């Protein structure tokens, strides 16, 4: 069950128009307030004209519109449920612009919502592009439009939110498919529920940024309900998804063939563990007592080439536990893991105590000191975020989280940890003056220019309650050691929400909820367009282009040569991301030091240490003197 961001606009004076209406199922039966009457397009004697069908509302005055909702017919007949759809707003009823929301609604009879940033408008149009089962018709028992209490124009310079992407599931986990550019998402055995799973099934959905298409696919071949998993992209270019609702399983998502492949069971049953890809392309995981039982779950390691997991019992979980009020059940969850040099994995929190993990022999763990600064020792920060914004200098930015997983006040703590060699205690300092808004359950991504975007969360973590929401994102800019608030959004993104960097340099931020018939399921996502894509008039800036690359698969240590259609000042590599439960151990950034060959031709070296340039897929971005990034070119990095 979902909910709208607004309050329903009274419909007494509306005029509505539909492409067709069966008599008895007139256009205005969708706004008579009777749930047992519906609008329905032509069928029968009138022929069965096919979608797109269109429902247009003239609301007579300008309202501060922030959603609409559609109640399907309730007579047990599925005909005319809306699948693909687009929502447009207009002030003259003639010029509609770009959709403020689009995507697909799940095929059943529950009320569907489109939630989007407030926009003043007098006319609203819903286009039903497909029917949910492929049939000719559209029907709707009640359509409502919602408004916010006010409207404030976004401020120049601080980015923009929108459009909304409407989805058939809550995307509580997601990954970019690097070879196609699509956003892959999944929930669990149900579109919005995880409890009582019979195991064996994951609902997935994908959004294609370049066609805007949302599709879906029910995955049973890996016999894995993947809610609550570790996620890493391995050196063979496959995404390893572990445990969760089926605590022993491994599923492999292969972006090239766009398919799922069974992997070998883990040695230990786990849920809510973090896994991290290693400098040799293998994947390490540790902890995870959400499923498979509560007990000490020390490290293990997955080998893509031999397809085995092997236990590393001396990579001990004890040193990284938090003091969670709930004990080991929570206290070994969501470690801030980063693969680093020579097979090591750094654990940056959420526990105060940071640790080196080693994966030779049966494993090892070594204290790396406490996360702290001149302001004191940092407390446990369960579901705080950690992001490696400069792998070449070992820089990790950490921020937010709370001492307990849930029912717990979040903080504005933030640190910069600087990694050196494995086994040495890194320098950690406070980042700037901390976050503007205390938050937990927020998500974050490093952006092409090295800044880190931070969004959503709530001030006090109370899972599934969209209370104390934080609507204003922050960006940390490391060269200034400063945070900057960005334009706010209107959809709560708290527990079970995700963010990822898209190839076109925008941020995709969605989910939140996945709690059954709770009222806080967000079956959607929105795009955030950072300010670096706008010129100083607030139009989209012209972006440099990479017109050639000399290779798109390179070995650590190797050079790449590019041509561009114009001069570039900076370049960076950003490793593709994956995301669930605040955790993303896949993204990281490498700033590139460019050789200018002349004529808009440049080279750079991929760092030769593959604990820095972790093997897998990376995005190459180049930025012009104005700071505008290109869209990414995909580079596979090997070792
Ligand atoms: Ca009705
Ligand atoms: Cu969860």
From Swiss-Prot:
Cross-link position per record: 3'-(S-cysteinyl)-tyrosine (Cys-Tyr): 228-272
Cofactor list: Cu(2+)
Free-text comment on the cofactor: Binds 1 Cu(2+) ion per subunit.
pH dependence, entry free text: Optimum pH is 7. Active from pH 5.7 to 9.4.
Each Kelch repeat, start to end: 182-227, 238-280, 282-331, 395-449, 451-503
UniProt note on regulation of activity: Inhibited by diethyldithiocarbamate.
Variant or mutagenesis effect after changing residue 436 to A: No effect. Improves catalytic efficiency 2- to 3-fold towards D-galactose and 1-methyl-alpha-D-galactopyranoside. Improves catalytic activity 4.7-fold towards D-galactose, but only 1.8-fold towards 1-methyl-alpha-D-galactopyranoside
PTM comment, free text: Galactose oxidase contains a protein-derived free radical cofactor. In the active state, Tyr-272, which is cross-linked to Cys-228 via a thioether bond, is oxidized to a radical and acts with Cu(2+) as a two-electron acceptor in the oxidation reaction. The post-translational formation of the cross-link is closely linked to the propeptide cleavage event, and both are copper-dependent, autocatalytic processes.
Catalytic activity field: D-galactose + O2 = D-galacto-hexodialdose + H2O2
Compartments where located: Secreted
Gene3D superfamilies: Galactose oxidase/kelch, beta-propeller, Galactose-binding domain-like, Immunoglobulins
Sorted UniProt keywords: Copper, Disulfide bond, Kelch repeat, Metal-binding, Oxidoreductase, Repeat, Secreted, Signal, Thioether bond
A Gene Ontology term for the protein's cellular component: extracellular region
Single Gene Ontology MF annotation: metal ion binding
Residue ranges of domain F5/8 type C in the record: 1-148
CDD domains per UniProt: E_set_GO_C (cd02851), FA58C (cd00057)
Positions annotated as active site in the UniProt record: 495 (proton acceptor)
EC number: 1.1.3.9
Main location: secreted
Keyword Metal-binding: yes
Enzyme class: oxidoreductase
Quaternary structure and partners: Monomer.
Functional description taken from the UniProt entry: Catalyzes the sterospecific oxidation of primary alcohols to the corresponding aldehydes. The biologically relevant substrate of the enzyme is not known as the enzyme exhibits broad substrate specificity from small alcohols through sugars to oligo- and polysaccharides.
Protein's recorded name: Galactose oxidase
Species for this entry: Gibberella zeae (Wheat head blight fungus)
Lineage: Eukaryota, Fungi, Dikarya, Ascomycota, Pezizomycotina
Gene name for this UniProt entry: GAOA
């Amino acid at each position: 069950a979902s909910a709208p961001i607004g309050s329903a606009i009274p419909r007494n004076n509306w005029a509505v128009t539909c492409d067709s209406a069966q008599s008895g199922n007139e256009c205005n039966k969708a706004i008579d307030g009777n749930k047992d009457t519906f609008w329905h397009t032509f069928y029968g004697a009138n022929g069965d004209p096919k979608p797109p069908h269109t429902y247009t509302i003239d609301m007579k005055t300008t309202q501060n519109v922030n959603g609409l909702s559609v109640l399907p017919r309730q007579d047990g007949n599925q005909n005319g449920w809306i699948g693909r759809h687009e929502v447009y707003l207009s002030s003259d009823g003639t010029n509609w612009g770009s959709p403020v929301a689009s995507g697909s609604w799940f095929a059943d009879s529950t009320t569907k919502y489109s939630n989007f940033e407030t926009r003043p408008a007098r006319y609203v149009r819903l286009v039903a592009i497909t029917e949910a089962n492929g049939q000719p018709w559209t029907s709707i028992a009640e359509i409502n439009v919602f408004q916010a209490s006010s409207y404030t124009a976004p401020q120049p310079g601080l980015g923009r939110w929108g459009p909304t992407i409407d989805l058939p599931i809550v995307p509580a986990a997601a990954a970019i498919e690097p070879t196609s550019g699509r956003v892959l998402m999944w929930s669990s055995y149900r579109n919005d529920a995880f409890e009582g799973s019979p195991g064996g099934i994951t609902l997935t959905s994908s959004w294609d940024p370049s066609t805007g298409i949302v599709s879906d696919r029910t995955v049973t071949v890996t016999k894995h309900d993947m809610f609550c998993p570790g996620i890493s992209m391995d050196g063979n270019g496959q995404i390893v998804v572990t445990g969760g609702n089926d605590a022993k399983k491994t599923s492999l998502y292969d972006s090239s063939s766009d398919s799922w492949i069974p992997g070998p069971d883990m040695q230990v049953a786990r849920g809510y563990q973090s896994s991290a890809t290693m400098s040799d392309g293998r994947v390490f995981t540790i902890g995870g007592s959400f499923s498979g039982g509560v007990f000490e779950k020390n490290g293990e390691v997955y080998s893509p080439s031999s397809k085995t997991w092997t236990s590393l019992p001396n990579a001990k979980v004890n040193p990284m536990l938090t003091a969670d009020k709930q004990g080991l059940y929570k206290s070994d969850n969501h470690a801030w893991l980063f693969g680093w040099k020579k097979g090591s994995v750094f654990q940056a929190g959420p526990s105060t105590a940071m640790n080196w993990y080693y994966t030779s022999g049966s494993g090892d763990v070594k204290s790396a000191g406490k996360r702290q600064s001149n302001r004191g020792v940092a407390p446990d920060a369960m579901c705080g975020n950690a992001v490696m914004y400069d792998a070449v200098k070992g820089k990790i930015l950490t921020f937010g989280g709370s001492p307990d997983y849930t029912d717990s006040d979040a903080t504005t703590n933030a640190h910069i940890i600087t990694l050196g060699e494995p086994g040495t205690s890194p320098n950690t300092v406070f980042a700037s003056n901390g976050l503007y808004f205390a938050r937990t359950f927020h998500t974050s991504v490093v952006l092409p220019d090295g800044s880190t975007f931070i969004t959503g969360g709530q001030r006090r973590g109370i899972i599934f309650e969209d209370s104390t929401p934080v609507f204003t994102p922050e960006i940390y800019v490391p060269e200034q050691d400063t945070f900057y608030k960005q334009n706010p959004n209107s959809i709560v993104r708290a527990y079970h929400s995700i963010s990822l960097l898209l190839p076109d340099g925008r941020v995709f931020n969605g989910g939140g909820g996945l709690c059954g018939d709770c009222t806080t399921n967000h079956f959607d996502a929105q795009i955030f367009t950072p300010n670096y894509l706008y010129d100083s008039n607030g139009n989209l800036a012209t972006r440099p282009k990479i017109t050639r690359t000399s290779t798109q698969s390179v070995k650590v240590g190797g050079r790449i040569t590019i041509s561009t259609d114009s001069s570039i000042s900076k370049a960076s590599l950003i490793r593709y991301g994956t995301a669930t439960h605040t955790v993303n151990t896949d993204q990281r950034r490498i700033p590139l030091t460019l050789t200018n060959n002349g004529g808009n031709s440049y080279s750079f070296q991929v760092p030769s240490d593959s604990g820095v340039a972790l093997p897998g897929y990376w995005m190459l971005f180049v930025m012009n003197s104005a700071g505008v990034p290109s869209v990414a070119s995909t580079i596979r990095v090997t070792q």
